[PDB]
Design a protein around this ligand. Structure first.
Ligand SMILES: *[C@@H]1O[C@H](CO)[C@@H](O[C@@H]2O[C@H](CO)[C@@H](O)[C@H](O)[C@H]2NC(C)=O)[C@H](O)[C@H]1NC(C)=O
Ligand SMILES: *[C@@H]1O[C@H](CO)[C@@H](O[C@@H]2O[C@H](CO)[C@@H](O)[C@H](O)[C@H]2NC(C)=O)[C@H](O)[C@H]1NC(C)=O
Ligand SMILES: *[C@@H]1O[C@H](CO)[C@@H](O)[C@H](O)[C@H]1NC(C)=O
Ligand SMILES: *[C@@H]1O[C@H](CO)[C@@H](O)[C@H](O)[C@H]1NC(C)=O
Ligand SMILES: *[C@@H]1O[C@H](CO)[C@@H](O)[C@H](O)[C@H]1NC(C)=O
Ligand SMILES: *[C@@H]1O[C@H](CO)[C@@H](O)[C@H](O)[C@H]1NC(C)=O
Ligand SMILES: *[C@@H]1O[C@H](CO)[C@@H](O)[C@H](O)[C@H]1NC(C)=O
Ligand SMILES: *[C@@H]1O[C@H](CO)[C@@H](O)[C@H](O)[C@H]1NC(C)=O
Ligand code: NA
Ligand code: NA
Ligand SMILES: [Xe]
Ligand SMILES: [Xe]
Lengths: 520, 520
């Protein structure tokens, strides 16, 4: 149930070695409590020692993480990526192109680091990759700390980091989530919630708390980064959120929903050189940012045009409980497609409407238009429209009923597709559709149903969690979290009693009926 | 449940293509009926067309086999070999040595074929490897017939063929079954039974019937091989038995139990050049043999010292029902260790004692002594002795009670370890041990038991089937077959109600309570 490990540097050796238990003298230590049977979550607590340089800390952080979560990593790999571009892959094809792309990209980053040893930016990127290298090395049982260049394998643990990036890399290489930010009445509080939609096979979950001692640049005279403390929802072997939902010790909450790209003329902006993958840009921005504007400035450098998201950056340092609109700084919105990033401060809009909802469609009209959504509105109607899609419509009618944390959870878990008129798809047979909800349950659509596009089909996919925080909760690096598909008004998901009983789901509860829990 | 495919050659193309259904004009066709839910067996029926050359036939036979069993192959790979020398393997080490060994061996065979285009022997080896190449190509969805040299990947579908060979290759590269042949009273019949002991994760089973049109040598003027028709117990993706148990259309039944090698001074005889892996030697001998003597002559060429077995070759053509001992030809015994193969005709001995039992210990004293079993007898006693081990003792007391086919099944499924004095291990606590039986049930030994060596421990391993044939049944290419661990006097094995519920067993029944069936 619980496991603690520390990575020590033996100065006389000078070899890195793992020891069981807590050793404050170590480079890093981690502690995992698996409570998946009881709550649907595991919990990871990890620390690095600032008496060592931040490069050794990063490597050690990956090492001790892998060390306490080996079984979970094994099962997650088996559930999610074991067949991806495997030995027997038919598309031979796409896989060689993918592997060439990733090797060129990894090699491009290694070259930039060696050409720029004094760059704060490339220092942050190197820390991130050292952590990835530590994680893989540890899992394989053989530790080797690199002082210069190192090789990340394209299809090893990197594959756990790039699942979001692969959504765009697949079409670019020619292969054949709900969020709500709610200002409570009288400005009493500011609530921030996110509900990740994913495949049911991905539901091995870890909430991770990192306490690092990284510096902004490659010399010890640089200040400690603003984002050394963070809590985020995550997965085994994944050294960032993926959801995404982070509470940062710099006073920021960062979260996104995915927008993607439907314009094939934009794929030419996805290149192996001059592009840093989204997961790294996300990690680097989270570390360096003091505020929304700085987060956006850092994140949009070397835009890969992969894992194209709408990001919301909430800066709780600019929020005064009971206060009037400060005019700026509270909410920053960023949208990314290939070749284009649009950023705006949306504080005034948040104070005006009292909320900001996000649901997989870009808010910025230039981004909406550039990514090909007009043609989809024209072909299929309001489902692709920003203001008139079902989720937008449910948020419009129900957001004001969120008056507290539990009400937020209720809306974020909302799915009553059999009875809600906003869940009716006129082109579909049957008309009610379980996709048309705050928390989707695609498993509940009939397999012989008639649907106009793929998103509406029966699938082992839907809302798989909710995380909620507030001004006071974020201050204590804390959230409410519920794991599993929604069961408030829908029958609980159960693997053995579903059309998907045969899918691998190692380590996962059969029945998903968990209630929200306080983390920590 | 049932699927039929044919591989056609379009002469105008001239491309190989798969079509559904039966097309007698095709190069090959196959037909799989999965009855695993009902009986514990699937059934494969495969034919090749003799109007094409035997090289194209062999390739096509692998193609159509993979074609009708893709799902089963996928599940078997996942259950058995998915983690073997994988991307994240710790023993880095052994795996590089294994891969170098197999590549050198495969390359050595390719060179011998190109240096010996007129050799019948190397023609038979090439047919076998073409079948392996067809099977892998088909599964990967891209067919390419080689007219000269070709590359087999070391860790692809080859891994499904060499699990027996790996038992000896592992220790040789420094990595850190019951049978009864029974003469019925008055010589009325001759019964031949085999009960394979294996890991429970291997219990995806296919009984395979091949009807080939191969010739002895590379020119059409050569006669058709003696063993073009065969029925054998097998596994998905495995182009030979593995058990082993074969009924050959040449009048022979071939079966083995594994002896292994415990003498490390003999590993130097396991070399990549000058050694053909046991699975190929087994297939080639089965094809070419007319009698026991010829089978042994062919099989012992290029002895790899891997998958070291005691082979029994029963020649039903030499058996006269009700007749006296013919003095020779009925039973041939062969034993293989690295650097040594001993062969003897054991007809007179069979007629004298009325039976031949086999149980993982060499009969030949020179082989018993050379493979290091004397030191194990001296350290642990009768368990390693040929005449005084538990199975030898049960056969000695009970073999005469086999008076018919059902009685044979009963003895071959025999395990009453809680009550049988012959199942008591004096060095063990508790004393009765579920390994000490005709059909082992290691799952039933207590996990906290005290045992003197590994074989006696709790393990997900034991007797997993029984096949029985007779003079009349073999003539009609037929057998009795029962799938699963024994449940005659032991509680039925059930995955969900065992200490091994977490092990992957995709596609397998949860509960194993199947009775014998007539095949076909
Ligand atoms: C950070 O600290 C580590 C550990 O002290 C340094 O690594 C050593 O570097 C020297 C010379 O480059 C090597 O000979 C040692 O083998 C290294 N030790 C280990 C444990 O690998 C490292 O140089 C420091 N700085 C950076 C940027 O990594
Ligand atoms: C057996 O038959 C096959 C099919 O007719 C022969 O293969 C052809 O060989 C020629 C010349 O070597 C190639 O150009 C064709 O492309 C082959 N056809 C196919 C379908 O691949 C083959 O040569 C014959 N003999 C052997 C030993 O394979
Ligand atoms: C993918 O295919 C398109 C053809 O529509 C081509 O223009 C493009 O260069 C290809 N890109 C890659 C990287 O394969
Ligand atoms: C986007 O496209 C729509 C439909 O063609 C058009 O009416 C609108 O002006 C465009 N908006 C912007 C800002 O480009
Ligand atoms: C599939 O739809 C049909 C109507 O076409 C319906 O009668 C049936 O209940 C559905 N199948 C199942 C298994 O429920
Ligand atoms: C394995 O190790 C032994 C040392 O006992 C050595 O003599 C032998 O050559 C090694 N063989 C291989 C192939 O690794
Ligand atoms: C085998 O070894 C035993 C025990 O050392 C010995 O007594 C016996 O003579 C040997 N048998 C043969 C044929 O080598
Ligand atoms: C393990 O053995 C002990 C005796 O040491 C026994 O009491 C116990 O029943 C065994 N464990 C289980 C789970 O049965
Ligand atoms: Na997302
Ligand atoms: Na065997
Ligand atoms: Xe990238
Ligand atoms: Xe070999």
């Amino acid at each position: 149930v619980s496991r603690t490990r520390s990575l020590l540097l033996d100065a006389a050796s000078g070899q890195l070695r793992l020891e069981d238990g807590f050793h404050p003298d170590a480079v890093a230590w981690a502690n995992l409590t698996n409570a998946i049977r009881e709550t649907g979550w595991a919990y990871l607590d990890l620390s690095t020692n600032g008496r060592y340089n931040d490069s050794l800390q990063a490597y050690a952080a990956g090492v001790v993480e892998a060390s306490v979560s080996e079984e979970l990593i094994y099962m997650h790999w088996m559930n999610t990526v074991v067949n991806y571009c495997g030995p027997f892959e038919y598309e031979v094809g796409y896989c060689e192109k993918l592997k060439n792309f990733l090797e060129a990209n990894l090699e491009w980053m290694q070259r930039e680091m060696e050409l720029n040893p004094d760059s704060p930016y490339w220092h942050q990127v190197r820390l991130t990759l050292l952590q990835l290298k530590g994680l893989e090395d540890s899992y394989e049982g053989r530790l080797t700390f690199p002082t210069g260049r190192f090789t990340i394998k394209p299809l090893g643990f990197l594959l756990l980091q790039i699942s979001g990036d692969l959504e765009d890399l697949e079409p670019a290489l020619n292969k054949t989530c709900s969020a709500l930010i709610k200002l409570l009445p009288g400005g009493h509080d500011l609530l921030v919630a996110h509900n990740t939609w994913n495949s049911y096979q991905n539901m091995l979950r870890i909430i991770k708390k990192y306490r690092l001692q990284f510096r902004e640049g490659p010399q010890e005279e640089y200040p400690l980064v603003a984002g050394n403390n963070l809590v985020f929802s995550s997965y085994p072997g994944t050294i960032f959120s993926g959801d995404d939902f982070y509470i940062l010790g710099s006073g920021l909450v960062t979260l996104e929903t995915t927008i993607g790209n439907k314009n094939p003329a934009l794929w030419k902006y996805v290149q192996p050189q001059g592009c840093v993958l989204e997961w790294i840009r996300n990690v680097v921005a989270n570390r360096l940012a003091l505020d929304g504007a700085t987060w956006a400035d850092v994140f949009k450098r070397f835009n890969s045009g992969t894992y194209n998201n709408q990001w919301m950056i909430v800066d709780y340092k600019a929020f005064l409980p009971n206060g009037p609109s400060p005019g700026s700084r509270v909410l920053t919105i960023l949208e990314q497609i290939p070749g284009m990033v649009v950023v705006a401060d949306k504080t005034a809009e948040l104070y005006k409407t009292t909320y900001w909802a996000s649901y997989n469609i870009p808010y910025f009209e230039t981004v909406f238009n550039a990514s090909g959504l007009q043609a989809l509105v024209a072909q299929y109607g309001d489902w692709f429209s920003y203001t008139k899609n079902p989720r937008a419509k449910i948020f419009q009618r129900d957001q004001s009923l969120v008056e507290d944390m539990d009400a937020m959870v209720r809306l974020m878990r909302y799915n009553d597709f059999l009875h809600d008129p906003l869940s009716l798809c006129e082109a579909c047979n049957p008309k009610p559709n379980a996709e048309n909800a705050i928390s989707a349950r695609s498993d509940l659509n009939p397999a012989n149903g008639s649907y106009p596009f793929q998103a509406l089909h029966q699938r082992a996919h839907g809302g798989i969690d909710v995380k909620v925080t507030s001004f006071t909760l974020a201050k204590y690096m804390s959230m409410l979290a519920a794991s599993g598909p929604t069961w408030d008004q829908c029958p609980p998901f159960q693997w053995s009693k579903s059309p998907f009983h045969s899918m691998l789901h190692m380590g996962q509860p059969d029945l998903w009926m968990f209630s929200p829990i306080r983390v920590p």
